[PDB]
Amino acid sequence: SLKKLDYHFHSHFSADSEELPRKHVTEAIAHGLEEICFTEHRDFYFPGMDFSLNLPEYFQEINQLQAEFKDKIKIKIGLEMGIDLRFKSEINQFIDSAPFDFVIASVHEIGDIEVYDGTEFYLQKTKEEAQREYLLACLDVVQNFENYNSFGHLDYVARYGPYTDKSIKFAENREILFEILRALASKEKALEINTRLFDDPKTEQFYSDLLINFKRLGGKFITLGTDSHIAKRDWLSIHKARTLIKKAGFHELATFSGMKIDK
Ligand SMILES: [Zn+2]
Ligand SMILES: [Zn+2]
Ligand SMILES: [Zn+2]
């Protein structure tokens, strides 16, 4: 069976969450999770809003929780790193500055335009064009950046936009997704299954296709996370994602210590 875990979530150390770190831990324990990894935001030069991370306070707090809850759950100290290749040196210096257990590489902005509801990003742009641009940026990251463990939310672009149906389809993006998935597999990176939109069957379909094609292209490593910014989680969405990962033929989820996969 897949280990019960959450490898993508945010607490008050992230600029867009107010959650108490301890509440994530107690919720995790209450739902039988064996392991969790905090993955707070750092995004360099993010447009319109600071996404900085106080490393001394973050590490001190999670280290305290690790000790407090040692007998009950395994806690890892990770990072969701927004990638922009213009800032590669700053990004690598940041990752290498503290003993992170796990790093997610994510695309949150492209060309100083945030990928979010209401921004320039979706304005006078078809959904298909927004998807094309988003995935091109993801490929750019996978081809040119190495200092991470798992690739975050490939469906991020489907969270937003003026469209009534914001869903992303694998087939409409096949060529670029094959390139991304083949490169992740070749470089021994994990694919994140992100449950944020899993209450929508169209999200399940997209990730089903991602999983099947990743495996066909040599993919081995899968991480699972909620992107929850509060402790209270949608547990049905987590169950759906786990069921899907199993159906696709993956028998384990990847966990990391000091940015090295646990074996
Ligand atoms: Zn956030
Ligand atoms: Zn993200
Ligand atoms: Zn996140």
Short mmCIF file of C-alpha atoms and ligand atoms in Angstrom, two decimals:
data_model
loop_
_atom_site.label_atom_id
_atom_site.label_comp_id
_atom_site.label_asym_id
_atom_site.label_seq_id
_atom_site.Cartn_x
_atom_site.Cartn_y
_atom_site.Cartn_z
CA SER A 1 0.00 0.00 0.00
CA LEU A 2 1.04 3.62 -0.59
CA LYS A 3 2.35 5.38 2.51
CA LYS A 4 -0.20 7.80 3.95
CA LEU A 5 1.35 11.23 3.63
CA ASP A 6 1.08 14.84 2.46
CA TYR A 7 4.08 16.26 0.61
CA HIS A 8 2.72 19.71 -0.37
CA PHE A 9 1.16 22.16 2.07
CA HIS A 10 1.59 25.63 3.50
CA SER A 11 1.54 27.19 6.97
CA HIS A 12 1.91 30.72 8.27
CA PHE A 13 5.57 30.67 7.21
CA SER A 14 4.24 31.04 3.64
CA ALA A 15 3.20 34.55 2.65
CA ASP A 16 -0.33 33.43 1.70
CA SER A 17 -1.23 31.23 4.67
CA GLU A 18 -2.15 31.94 8.28
CA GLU A 19 -2.23 28.36 9.52
CA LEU A 20 -0.50 27.24 12.70
CA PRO A 21 2.15 24.63 11.88
CA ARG A 22 1.09 22.52 14.87
CA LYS A 23 -2.45 22.23 13.50
CA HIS A 24 -1.14 20.60 10.32
CA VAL A 25 0.61 18.02 12.49
CA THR A 26 -2.37 17.23 14.69
CA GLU A 27 -4.69 16.96 11.68
CA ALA A 28 -2.20 14.66 9.97
CA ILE A 29 -2.01 12.42 13.04
CA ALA A 30 -5.81 12.39 13.40
CA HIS A 31 -6.10 11.04 9.84
CA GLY A 32 -3.38 8.42 10.19
CA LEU A 33 -0.66 10.02 8.07
CA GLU A 34 2.75 8.38 8.59
CA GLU A 35 4.74 11.29 7.18
CA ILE A 36 4.31 14.94 6.21
CA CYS A 37 6.59 17.48 4.57
CA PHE A 38 5.98 21.19 5.06
CA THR A 39 6.61 22.92 1.70
CA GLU A 40 6.56 26.65 2.29
CA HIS A 41 6.69 29.15 -0.58
CA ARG A 42 9.78 30.95 -1.72
CA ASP A 43 9.37 32.86 -5.00
CA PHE A 44 12.08 35.31 -6.00
CA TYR A 45 10.98 38.75 -7.20
CA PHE A 46 7.37 37.63 -7.33
CA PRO A 47 5.22 40.23 -9.04
CA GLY A 48 3.02 42.36 -6.81
CA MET A 49 3.60 40.39 -3.61
CA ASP A 50 6.57 39.31 -1.48
CA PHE A 51 6.93 35.52 -1.07
CA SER A 52 9.86 35.36 1.33
CA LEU A 53 10.60 32.72 3.95
CA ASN A 54 12.12 33.20 7.40
CA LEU A 55 14.51 30.27 7.53
CA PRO A 56 15.64 30.59 11.16
CA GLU A 57 12.04 30.70 12.44
CA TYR A 58 10.80 28.02 10.01
CA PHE A 59 13.51 25.50 10.83
CA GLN A 60 13.31 26.22 14.55
CA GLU A 61 9.56 25.60 14.62
CA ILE A 62 9.50 22.47 12.49
CA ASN A 63 12.50 21.07 14.40
CA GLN A 64 10.48 21.57 17.61
CA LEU A 65 7.49 19.75 16.12
CA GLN A 66 9.72 16.88 14.95
CA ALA A 67 10.88 16.34 18.52
CA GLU A 68 7.45 16.81 20.09
CA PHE A 69 5.76 14.32 17.78
CA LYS A 70 8.67 11.92 17.19
CA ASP A 71 6.74 8.85 18.32
CA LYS A 72 3.62 9.64 16.31
CA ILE A 73 4.53 10.90 12.81
CA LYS A 74 7.59 11.64 10.68
CA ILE A 75 7.94 15.31 9.78
CA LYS A 76 10.19 16.68 7.02
CA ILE A 77 11.16 20.29 6.35
CA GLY A 78 10.71 21.19 2.71
CA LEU A 79 10.28 23.96 0.22
CA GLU A 80 8.09 24.90 -2.71
CA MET A 81 10.43 26.86 -4.93
CA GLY A 82 8.87 29.03 -7.62
CA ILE A 83 11.25 28.82 -10.58
CA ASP A 84 12.20 31.54 -13.04
CA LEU A 85 15.44 30.90 -14.90
CA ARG A 86 16.36 34.59 -14.79
CA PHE A 87 16.98 34.05 -11.06
CA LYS A 88 18.67 30.64 -11.22
CA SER A 89 21.70 31.69 -9.17
CA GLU A 90 19.58 33.23 -6.39
CA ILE A 91 17.32 30.19 -6.40
CA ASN A 92 20.18 27.71 -6.10
CA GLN A 93 21.86 29.76 -3.39
CA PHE A 94 18.61 29.75 -1.43
CA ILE A 95 18.03 26.01 -1.78
CA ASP A 96 21.64 25.32 -0.78
CA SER A 97 21.48 27.67 2.24
CA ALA A 98 19.67 25.36 4.69
CA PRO A 99 19.14 21.62 5.16
CA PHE A 100 15.85 21.18 3.30
CA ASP A 101 14.57 17.62 3.07
CA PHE A 102 12.56 18.09 -0.12
CA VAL A 103 12.12 20.68 -2.84
CA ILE A 104 9.24 21.12 -5.25
CA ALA A 105 9.94 23.08 -8.45
CA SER A 106 6.86 25.06 -9.49
CA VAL A 107 5.84 27.62 -12.08
CA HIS A 108 3.76 30.44 -10.54
CA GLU A 109 4.65 33.39 -12.80
CA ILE A 110 5.94 33.77 -16.34
CA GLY A 111 7.65 36.93 -17.59
CA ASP A 112 6.71 38.75 -14.36
CA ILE A 113 3.03 37.96 -14.91
CA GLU A 114 1.47 35.86 -12.17
CA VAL A 115 -0.53 32.87 -13.30
CA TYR A 116 -3.69 33.61 -11.34
CA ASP A 117 -7.26 34.77 -11.59
CA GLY A 118 -7.55 38.37 -12.69
CA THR A 119 -4.01 38.94 -13.92
CA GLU A 120 -2.79 39.85 -17.40
CA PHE A 121 -2.09 36.14 -17.85
CA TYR A 122 -5.57 35.12 -18.97
CA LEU A 123 -6.67 38.45 -20.45
CA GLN A 124 -7.74 38.16 -24.11
CA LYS A 125 -6.19 34.72 -24.21
CA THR A 126 -7.87 31.44 -25.04
CA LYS A 127 -7.68 28.68 -22.46
CA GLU A 128 -5.72 26.63 -24.95
CA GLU A 129 -3.15 29.44 -25.37
CA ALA A 130 -2.84 29.89 -21.59
CA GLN A 131 -2.18 26.16 -21.27
CA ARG A 132 0.36 26.22 -24.10
CA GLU A 133 2.29 29.06 -22.49
CA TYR A 134 2.12 27.54 -19.01
CA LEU A 135 3.43 24.17 -20.13
CA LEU A 136 6.17 25.72 -22.25
CA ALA A 137 7.44 27.44 -19.10
CA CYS A 138 7.27 24.13 -17.22
CA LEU A 139 9.35 22.47 -19.93
CA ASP A 140 11.86 25.32 -19.77
CA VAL A 141 12.28 24.66 -16.04
CA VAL A 142 12.62 20.89 -16.46
CA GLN A 143 15.23 21.30 -19.21
CA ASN A 144 17.32 23.95 -17.48
CA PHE A 145 16.99 23.52 -13.71
CA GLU A 146 18.02 20.51 -11.66
CA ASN A 147 18.03 21.41 -7.97
CA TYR A 148 14.71 19.89 -6.90
CA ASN A 149 13.00 16.58 -6.17
CA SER A 150 9.46 16.78 -7.54
CA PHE A 151 7.71 18.86 -10.21
CA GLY A 152 4.72 20.72 -8.80
CA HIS A 153 1.13 20.92 -10.02
CA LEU A 154 1.28 20.60 -13.81
CA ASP A 155 -2.44 21.50 -13.76
CA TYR A 156 -1.84 24.81 -11.94
CA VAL A 157 -3.07 26.75 -14.98
CA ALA A 158 -6.44 24.98 -14.73
CA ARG A 159 -7.13 26.53 -11.33
CA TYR A 160 -7.83 29.94 -12.86
CA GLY A 161 -9.17 31.89 -15.79
CA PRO A 162 -12.39 33.57 -16.91
CA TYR A 163 -13.57 30.35 -18.60
CA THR A 164 -16.55 28.41 -17.23
CA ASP A 165 -14.71 25.15 -18.00
CA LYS A 166 -11.11 25.69 -16.88
CA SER A 167 -10.08 22.06 -17.30
CA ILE A 168 -6.89 20.94 -19.00
CA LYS A 169 -6.85 17.92 -21.31
CA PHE A 170 -3.78 15.79 -21.86
CA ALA A 171 -4.52 15.13 -25.54
CA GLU A 172 -4.76 18.83 -26.39
CA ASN A 173 -1.28 19.27 -24.88
CA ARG A 174 0.22 15.92 -25.83
CA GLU A 175 3.47 16.95 -27.47
CA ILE A 176 4.68 19.21 -24.66
CA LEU A 177 3.50 16.86 -21.93
CA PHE A 178 5.40 13.96 -23.51
CA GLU A 179 8.51 16.15 -23.51
CA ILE A 180 8.03 17.19 -19.87
CA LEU A 181 7.28 13.67 -18.65
CA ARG A 182 10.12 12.05 -20.58
CA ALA A 183 12.57 14.60 -19.20
CA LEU A 184 11.37 14.19 -15.60
CA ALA A 185 11.76 10.42 -15.92
CA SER A 186 15.19 10.69 -17.55
CA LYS A 187 16.42 13.05 -14.83
CA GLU A 188 15.03 10.87 -12.02
CA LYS A 189 12.61 13.50 -10.81
CA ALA A 190 9.24 12.85 -9.23
CA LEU A 191 5.88 13.86 -10.66
CA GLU A 192 3.58 15.55 -8.13
CA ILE A 193 -0.03 14.47 -7.96
CA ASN A 194 -1.63 17.58 -6.51
CA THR A 195 -5.11 17.16 -5.03
CA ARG A 196 -6.14 20.84 -5.05
CA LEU A 197 -8.67 20.39 -7.89
CA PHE A 198 -9.48 16.71 -7.32
CA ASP A 199 -13.15 17.40 -6.54
CA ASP A 200 -13.55 17.82 -10.31
CA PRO A 201 -13.69 14.60 -12.39
CA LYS A 202 -11.88 16.43 -15.21
CA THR A 203 -8.90 16.85 -12.88
CA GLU A 204 -8.92 13.12 -12.20
CA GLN A 205 -8.93 12.49 -15.95
CA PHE A 206 -5.96 14.79 -16.53
CA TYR A 207 -3.89 13.21 -13.78
CA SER A 208 -4.89 9.72 -14.91
CA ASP A 209 -3.45 10.53 -18.34
CA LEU A 210 -0.37 12.12 -16.76
CA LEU A 211 0.28 9.02 -14.66
CA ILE A 212 -0.20 6.51 -17.48
CA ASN A 213 2.01 8.44 -19.86
CA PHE A 214 4.67 9.16 -17.21
CA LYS A 215 4.93 5.45 -16.48
CA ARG A 216 5.10 4.59 -20.19
CA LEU A 217 7.94 7.11 -20.56
CA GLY A 218 10.00 5.54 -17.79
CA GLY A 219 8.66 7.50 -14.81
CA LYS A 220 9.20 5.94 -11.39
CA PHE A 221 8.81 8.54 -8.64
CA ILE A 222 5.51 10.04 -7.52
CA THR A 223 4.80 12.52 -4.76
CA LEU A 224 1.36 13.31 -3.38
CA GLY A 225 0.26 16.61 -1.88
CA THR A 226 -2.79 18.74 -1.15
CA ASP A 227 -1.54 22.30 -1.55
CA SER A 228 -3.67 22.97 1.51
CA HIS A 229 -3.07 26.36 3.10
CA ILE A 230 -5.06 25.31 6.19
CA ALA A 231 -4.91 22.19 8.35
CA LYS A 232 -8.45 20.98 7.55
CA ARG A 233 -8.16 18.95 4.35
CA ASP A 234 -10.47 17.49 1.69
CA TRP A 235 -9.90 13.82 2.50
CA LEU A 236 -12.07 12.48 -0.31
CA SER A 237 -9.85 14.19 -2.88
CA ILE A 238 -6.81 12.59 -1.24
CA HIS A 239 -8.48 9.18 -1.40
CA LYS A 240 -9.35 9.69 -5.08
CA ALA A 241 -5.75 10.60 -5.91
CA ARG A 242 -4.37 7.59 -4.03
CA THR A 243 -6.83 5.30 -5.81
CA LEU A 244 -5.70 6.70 -9.14
CA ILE A 245 -1.99 6.35 -8.41
CA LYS A 246 -2.58 2.68 -7.54
CA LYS A 247 -4.70 2.10 -10.63
CA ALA A 248 -1.85 3.45 -12.78
CA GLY A 249 0.45 0.78 -11.35
CA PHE A 250 2.62 2.79 -8.93
CA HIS A 251 3.14 0.88 -5.67
CA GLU A 252 4.99 3.47 -3.63
CA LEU A 253 5.18 7.19 -3.09
CA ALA A 254 8.60 8.84 -2.97
CA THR A 255 9.77 10.40 0.29
CA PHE A 256 12.97 12.39 0.77
CA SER A 257 15.54 13.14 3.47
CA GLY A 258 18.15 15.85 2.89
CA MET A 259 16.91 16.02 -0.73
CA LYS A 260 17.85 12.38 -1.35
CA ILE A 261 15.14 9.81 -2.05
CA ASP A 262 14.49 7.43 0.85
CA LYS A 263 15.16 3.80 -0.05
ZN ZN B 1 0.16 29.55 -1.68
ZN ZN B 2 2.47 26.14 -6.17
ZN ZN B 3 1.82 25.21 -2.99
#
